[PDB]
Ligand binder design. Structure first.
Ligand SMILES: NC(=O)c1ccc[n+]([C@@H]2O[C@H](COP(=O)([O-])OP(=O)(O)OC[C@H]3O[C@@H](n4cnc5c(N)ncnc54)[C@H](O)[C@@H]3O)[C@@H](O)[C@H]2O)c1
Lengths: 333, 337
């Protein structure tokens, strides 16, 4: 078992934790969050507005929680440099506070004896998408990141189109569920004015590096994609809308068959999924895929110009990929 | 000199017909003198006119009688007929009838209003009649076209944008997405929708893929674009205001700055004034509530991958813009006899 510490017990931190309870090869042994105490922490585990109630046994002390009888240490430390991760045998720290997305600060987790760090967001570190480039990990890379939820949805789709038909150029939109960075009312957002507007009552254009980032995980696509986002009032589950020009001709049937084949390959099993059903966003709540290709919603203008639609639970799929990446890179020493 | 004030009848006081009516109260180039409906009585009509969850309260005197309503002293006759051939529009001086039943789109069907005395009919939706978008092809109207339609709100947003791109740089091909506010055809809970399974799912709690013919229909108002665009929609939980997201390949190289200039110049032209607007501000959808443009180009949100491949973002109040375009089309075609 790989012993994991979680820094920042938020939407991603708490769902990484629930996901870990379903795995036999990884175990969360320590949690840090400065806005919680252990008794409050088990309340936040128990009740979840998106993913429902957790029904296992939950107990607390003043410095630990117990989940189905297993004790997990709880820190409350604002500075990563001060977290004694090594004292509790933590091998990997999940860095999911949202405020240490830099190699500079995320590396301070190693000072306390963690051995590796996975940042749960894009960062100035090696970047990985499971299914696409996780086998490029090198053992000296002590601090890495798992990209964004959007990159994890788009990269498998782009790899299938590019490998089968070749992507000449592409532009992406993601229609994205609300996240914690948005306010409930019109509020200050110095670096992103539109992002300060009331989240629940607006379609809000937003910038994203996900399409560019696909060029980092798929090098031959460097410079050939870009895109943007619209934030909309839903609680969870987002969708990628990728318009691209293909080098070689592909009928809509050939695109469907390529996506279906890919969803059945060892490389993308559980990561890229395939549907022909009349689905809507809530149908992917608690679906652990990184990407589900929507055959009926995707459309072609012609054999060289297509719009592909792919769904992702931005909370649950990404959290499961964080654990997948930890397991994958842990085998590389 | 000036043009006459066109007398209009509204058939179907549903959401579109009622917003056309409200738009006409804010204006002086047209007046609605008669309203027909069968799900409403005159006292209930003034309640729906007075209060609006999107567009605010109407300030002005509203009264009702057994067969009419009064706005600021002016009497408007209210009908409750089933077979529109008997409707005596001509007795009340009605020149144009706005067909906002949300059903009637058969050419002969809509023509029944001419038996009562109306001269012309505008269908407030796509239909198997001549099709028009203000600023794009309204000057193609011929006086023998007694029944016409104003396309859809999405086509009225997309077509001005496509005209500027196509005329300045040339569209080779394009794929469009519209992220669209809720409409009345969607239910509040998961409910049967036999011709559209996704569209029966609860509207307020889902992103819902949907079909739209709007990108293909651009070929009807811009014939050289026939077969060069298609697209789709995502319905999302907002009350009003939608956005077109158009990904285009261009013939002539265009920098992002040249695209901005072309949209800006179009917004200042007599052809597109008040129809296509331009912004460089950090806007969000609620900033377009009660904005009567067909389309507002969003400079900061639009993005170019290269000089030949661009994504253009354009906002539209799907309720208020289209309602004002219906009245504009009435007026524009009334001048052609
Ligand atoms: N929510 C998503 O859909 C999603 C998907 C992929 C990646 N991410 C990324 O993952 C990160 C977390 O996002 P989230 O949505 O879980 O955020 P969140 O606001 O729900 O959680 C952040 C947590 O960090 C805690 N925290 C803040 N500063 C801390 C500190 N100094 N020490 C310890 N704890 C601290 C907060 O109390 C909070 O519980 C962000 O970088 C975000 O961009 C989010």
């Amino acid at each position: 078992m790989v012993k994991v510490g979680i820094n920042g017990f938020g939407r991603i931190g708490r769902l990484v934790f629930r996901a870990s309870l379903e795995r036999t090869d990884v175990e969360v042994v320590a949690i840090n969050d400065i806005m919680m105490t252990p008794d409050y922490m088990i309340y936040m585990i128990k009740y979840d507005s998106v993913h429902g109630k957790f029904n296992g046994k939950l107990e607390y002390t003043e410095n630990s929680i117990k989940v189905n009888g297993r004790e997990i240490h709880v820190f409350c430390e604002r500075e990563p440099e001060k977290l004694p991760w090594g004292q509790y045998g933590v091998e990997y720290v999940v860095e999911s506070t949202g405020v240490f997305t830099k190699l500079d600060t995320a590396s301070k987790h190693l000072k306390g004896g963690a051995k590796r760090v996975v940042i749960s967001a894009p960062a100035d570190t090696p970047t990985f998408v499971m299914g696409v480039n996780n086998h490029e990990f090198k053992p000296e890379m002590t601090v890495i990141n798992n990209a964004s939820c959007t990159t994890n949805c788009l990269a498998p789709i782009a790899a299938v189109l590019h490998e089968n038909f070749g992507i000449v150029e592409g532009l992406m939109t993601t229609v994205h569920a609300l996240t914690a960075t948005q306010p409930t009312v019109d509020a200050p957002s110095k670096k992103d004015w539109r992002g300060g507007r009331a989240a629940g009552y607006n379609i809000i254009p937003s910038s994203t590096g996900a399409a560019k980032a696909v060029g980092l995980v798929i090098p031959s696509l460097n410079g050939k994609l870009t895109g943007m986002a619209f934030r909309v009032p839903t609680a969870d589950v987002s969708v990628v809308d990728l318009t691209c020009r293909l080098e070689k001709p592909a009928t809509k049937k050939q695109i469907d068959e390529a996506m279906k084949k890919a969803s059945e390959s060892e490389r993308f099993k559980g990561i890229l999924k395939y549907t022909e059903e009349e689905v809507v966003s809530s149908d992917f709540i608690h679906d652990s895929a990184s990407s589900t290709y929507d055959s009926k919603a995707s459309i072609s203008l012609n054999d060289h110009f297509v719009k592909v639609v792919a769904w992702y639970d931005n909370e649950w799929g990404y959290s499961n990929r964080v654990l997948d990446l930890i397991i994958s890179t842990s085998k590389v020493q």
